[PDB]
Amino acid sequence: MTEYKLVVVGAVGVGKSALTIQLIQNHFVDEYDPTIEDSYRKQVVIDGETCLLDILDTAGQEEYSAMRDQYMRTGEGFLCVFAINNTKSFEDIHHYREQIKRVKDSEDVPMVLVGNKSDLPSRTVDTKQAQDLARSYGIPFIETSAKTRQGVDDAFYTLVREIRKHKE
Numbered sequence: 290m291t292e293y294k295l296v297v298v299g300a301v302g303v304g305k306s307a308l309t310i311q312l313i314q315n316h317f318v319d320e321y322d323p324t325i326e327d328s329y330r331k332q333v334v335i336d337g338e339t340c341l342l343d344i345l346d347t348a349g350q351e352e353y354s355a356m357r358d359q360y361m362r363t364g365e366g367f368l369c370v371f372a373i374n375n376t377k378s379f380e381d382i383h384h385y386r387e388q389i390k391r392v393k394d395s396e397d398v399p400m401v402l403v404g405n406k407s408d409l410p411s412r413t414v415d416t417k418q419a420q421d422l423a424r425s426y427g428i429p430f431i432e433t434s435a436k437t438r439q440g441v442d443d444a445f446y447t448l449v450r451e452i453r454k455h456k457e
């Protein structure tokens with residue numbers, strides 16, 4: 290059973306746990322817990338094939354940069370979780386991209402751009418703007434609703450497929 294390394298990255302105040310735990314035990318966490326190091330492994334059926342998803346939720350704190358580069362090198366698929374409720378996180382996507390490019394030693398890496406907090410009316414960045422910048426990354430963009438849990442399933446499905454496309 291293939292254990293795909295899923296690296297969940299994002300900014301502070303986005304709601305990474307609201308997406309990671311979401312499809313693990315089917316639960317939307319509201320409480321703000323500063324995720325430092327959590328691991329989620331579940332048998333996920335992707336493309337009619339049950340694979341053991343190895344998800345690692347880390348801290349978005351910039352105090353962990355050296356340790357970040359280490360696990361980033363061991364990561365295969367990167368989950369860029371950013372909230373559309375904050376424009377800073379959108380302009381910082383390229384910032385994190387540069388670091389990922391360095392650790393992966395490649396300009397091409399299987400990743401997905403998920404617009405978290407799409408269930409919030411306080412939307413700042415528009416869907417088209419998000420897709421516009423996504424073309425440069427070569428990665429798909431999906432609006433991941435946290436409270437409604439809409440788009441989260443397809444987002445995970447697409448990511449795994451991207452990783453498989455990279456491998457084979």
Ligand SMILES: O=C(CN1CCCC1)Nc1cccc(Cl)c1
Pocket residue numbers: 293294295296328330343344345360361362363364365
């Ligand atoms: O390291 C783990 C957890 N597995 C490793 C063996 C115990 C289960 N997951 C993970 C996910 C993405 C990136 C990296 Cl570096 C690790």
